[PDB]
Amino acid sequence: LVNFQQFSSQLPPFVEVLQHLSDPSWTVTHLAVESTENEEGCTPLHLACRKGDSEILVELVQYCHAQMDVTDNKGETAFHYAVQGDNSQVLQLLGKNASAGLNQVNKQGLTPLHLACQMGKQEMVRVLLLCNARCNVMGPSGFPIHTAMKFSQKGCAEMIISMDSSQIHSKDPRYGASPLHWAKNAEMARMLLKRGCDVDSTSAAGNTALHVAVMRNRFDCVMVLLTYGANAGTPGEHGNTPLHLAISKDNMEMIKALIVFGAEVDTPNDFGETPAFMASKISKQLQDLMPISPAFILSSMRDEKRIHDHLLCLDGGGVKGLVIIQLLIAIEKASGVATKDLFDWVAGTSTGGILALAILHSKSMAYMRGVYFRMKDEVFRGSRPYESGPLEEFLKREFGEHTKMTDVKKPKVMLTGTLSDRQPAELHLFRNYDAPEVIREPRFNQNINLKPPTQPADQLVWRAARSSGAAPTYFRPNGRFLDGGLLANNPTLDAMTEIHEYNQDMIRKGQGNKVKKLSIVVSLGTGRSPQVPVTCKELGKMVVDCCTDPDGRAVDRARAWSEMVGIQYFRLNPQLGSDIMLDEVNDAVLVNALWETEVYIYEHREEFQKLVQMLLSP
Amino acid sequence: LVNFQQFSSQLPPFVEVLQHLSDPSWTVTHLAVESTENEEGCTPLHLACRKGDSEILVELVQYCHAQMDVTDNKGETAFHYAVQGDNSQVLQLLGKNASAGLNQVNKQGLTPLHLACQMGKQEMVRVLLLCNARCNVMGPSGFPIHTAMKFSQKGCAEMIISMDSSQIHSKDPRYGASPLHWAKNAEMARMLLKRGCDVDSTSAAGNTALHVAVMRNRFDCVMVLLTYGANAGTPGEHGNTPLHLAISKDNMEMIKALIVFGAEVDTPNDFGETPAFMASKISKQLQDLMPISPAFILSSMRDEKRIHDHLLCLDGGGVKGLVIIQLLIAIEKASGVATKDLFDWVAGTSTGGILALAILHSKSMAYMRGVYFRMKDEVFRGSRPYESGPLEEFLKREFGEHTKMTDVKKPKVMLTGTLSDRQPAELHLFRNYDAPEVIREPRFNQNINLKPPTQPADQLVWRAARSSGAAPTYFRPNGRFLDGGLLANNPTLDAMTEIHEYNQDMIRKGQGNKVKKLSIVVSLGTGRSPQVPVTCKELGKMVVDCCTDPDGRAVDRARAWSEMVGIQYFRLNPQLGSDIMLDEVNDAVLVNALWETEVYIYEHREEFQKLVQMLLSP
């Protein structure tokens, strides 16, 4: 031991630090940082790159003769010996002339990109990307973008895709694949899908991404894909539609999730195996599960000017609005004639506000199901109250920041809203035809105290959509208006009031070719929770339960009054089996609820034929 | 000084307060208490009665020579030298043989009764009355009870009336008065009126009790009397209704008070002087305030079994129910046709619940105004929450502890109420016909959810009145039910739904004798607050304002739907000038609000006449 330290000092001419060099063979130029070599397989420039010493690096290559592209006996190069540390500037001083180690890579064939992907060193990835690191360098498991996702390093993958858009193209060399396909995590599916990613990019064999999520039993990504437009029923490798691949499991959640989003149940694979056959083989659960779906010439209906008048009444509600979407869809398909072109009047309160306002602008219905599924995650991030940046601006984008209300008027539409500007707390109908000016009874004005009122006539679609759609027991103070759920929450009863008011405005004006009788009124409710006894804040919040309950008397009133006039009130909503609350964002229970709704449509399925019958008659 | 104390010691043979007893001439037999006389107007036996020395009293007449019936130098007797003290047993020891002093009376005429009544020695009044004190002895101000009341001694008057109910009969000899008339104090009017005191008591001239209260300008007692049933407009002395007696003053508070409680303005006195004439003579306030300035053959109408059907819908509300009473009364008087006999159907929610239930049992409307004025002080003694002992027990009294609901069916009636037994929080109508057997669609049960709760058949008037009328934001948990203000709170919509439901049950049952189209529905609301702007717990309570709004859209809805059917909805209620709250007990503000209502009736002389016109039409 004495001779070792004698040589150590006799080098030191060329304390507990460097003593730990014993606890082992450095050299003068090697340990001079704490083009020579080591007995463990190292290099001095590599250690001065690793330890984040940048001026010592300036003093090792610019001052001394030490070539930069040094490859040790362990595979590594000078570039990716620094990304194990935290320098990020050594990379900049090494990205110079006569230094080609960027594509020189053999740990196991893992380019500096891939190593920075394995660890999580994102800033290192950016530093490499500004220096043209050639993400078109095929690796062991695939290209560098796939390496970021094999390990689920979020920041690194995000930086890669931000610098290079083209990386949404690259295919996994083993199986021709998208970045999504062989890379699955609930959040990552979204953080790539929001980027404009095609989900139907297929495969080597032909397997979709949701095929991969289903085969591995990750319900999360099945949902993330169906929401963002993935199409169930894709044949794939063996003609096994994603439905076959779920029945091969015991995941009823996923089977119902796919059946809701449109998968057929008789479609056979390449071998002829129908998925209902699969079901009856596996369990009796699934065979009982799958009985989901004739003069169908659609006799005498279009969007034209003739006798009667159809009304649609979309209640407010939570994210539960999806229920009515489903209902609408099964009506829309049971007549085939595109809900918007089916009804002459359409009214909505809160989520039905958003939805009615949408089906005015010629937005399709499954598309809207997707929209809510994509929005529930952005909007309901909060404790109880939400600052509405997400909801307001999501509507800005979804309907247009400059699109004003009365630009469309294809069917007449009305969104509710509680004008909380006044202690009276009146109701404002957001309307897009003109206005009903009738009769001559201003009950609060025309006497003194007070006339600073506003009522902004008819503009700014997104602004009205927010002023309607926020059930404010949840959101916040929201400008001048709160939900029309504070007063109406179920326009069914109130929209007929507006019908007759506007008709008397028309007639009084001598117009006289008013569209006559509301021949049909159809009110869709976002489901009913089940009936719990209460043998008793649960004694101070029942005020709000009553104030916004749409499925109590506001059915009986409207119905008996429709029977007074000749209307055939048609109230549609399913008994769910759960207290699905308004701001529910676990889409597992939301999908279960959509299945609940479709079971309701199945169980009735007669009322629907009779309603379509009425809706298309002469 | 030496001689005075010499006589004091020579008396001490005939212990430190005797010098200050000297300083003015007592004697041996005189000061032997602290049959001689005095130089200040006194007597020894009188002092042995005054000082409450009973054993000295036994030792002054039985042992010593002291006649009992000694009259002092200022008129007073031995009896009412003791009621200046507080013995009350010496009186009985003097209520013995050779003692006729009960009617021994001369201060200026002050019976033992009158002295004990003027001072307040109530126990003395009782002791004398138990000893046959012969109250038919005119004193200075009338009889002894009137002497008790000229000085407003409650204990004494109450004791007199306890011994003799007959003393609420006796008239002031000078003018002839119930104990009311020549005896005025706000509280005593009540503690005498609650005893069964008749207001129909006349005067010498013929003056009512409120005549004395008004001419003397004691607004307190005017209110206390109009409250307990006094009838303004009694002609009285000169044909001067108590209204004439206010206009000669400048007390507008009282003028409004009398016109509200029914005083006319066409009523001439003996001289032909209309009271509005008095006004225009007196002031320009009063000239503008009062004056009013003919098919009255009652053509072809009663309440029998014929074509159409009338409905009445009395909103809920606070103690403000008086408003609708006022309206009803001013409607009733404009037709003369006795509300119960005028409408075939009647619905009520909270105060209108009690009120409709009252007009069902043929309890008159002025009577209900009185009832509320007498009850409001009893029920609302609490800060926010009230334990309902007063309300529940007041209904027990006012409607009968054993009177069951369906004893009447005179007009069909329905009271609202929120059945809080269930998390759905349904609505139950307390009904008295039988029940409407719905189209057989019970959509909330039949998925066997629960059958341990019960839907309690038609019984128990007072219990239902409470289960409806108890606003639980104010009162308490109230059994299974809360206010009908959480629900309908303006039954008009729900009452018409129920009308039609019952009519279709009738027709469905093969009856074929439908009563009819309800040709008229009249909705009377407990006033409107004035319109307050809001530029902002006032955002957690505005939820409740919305939930219980009876004058917002539930007017427009009902109205436009009646225009669908042919009904001529009649919404009647006044713009108050104030936010009169629920548990308001200052009857001054309630009276101002009734004046607001009567001004509303003034301006609406067209609507009311048209409503009565239809109410009696073919």
Author numbering:
A (entry chain B), B (entry chain A): 81 to 94, 104 to 112, 118 to 128, 146 to 404, 409 to 651, 671 to 752
Task: Quote the original article.
The sequence can be divided into three parts: the N-terminal domain, the ankyrin repeat (AR) domain (ANK) and the catalytic domain (CAT). The lipid hydrolysis is executed by a Ser-Asp catalytic dyad in close spatial proximity to a glycine-rich motif. Here, we present the crystal structure of a mammalian iPLA2β, which revises previous structural models and reveals several unexpected features critical for regulation of its catalytic activity and localization in cells.
The structure of the short variant of iPLA2β (SH-iPLA2β, 752 amino acids) was solved by a combination of selenomethionine single-wavelength anomalous diffraction (SAD) with molecular replacement (MR) using two different protein models. The sequence assignment was guided by position of 51 selenium peaks and the structure was refined using 3.95 Å resolution data. The electron density map reveals nine ARs in the structure of SH-iPLA2β, instead of the previously predicted eight. The crystallographic asymmetric unit is formed by a dimer of iPLA2β. CAT domains interact through an extended, largely hydrophobic dimerization interface with a contact area of ~2,800 Å2 formed by three α-helices, several loops, including the long loop 554–570, and a part of the central β-sheet. By contrast, in iPLA2β, the active site cavity is wide open and can accommodate phospholipids with long polyunasturated fatty acid chains. A single anomalous peak was consistently found near Trp293 of AR6.
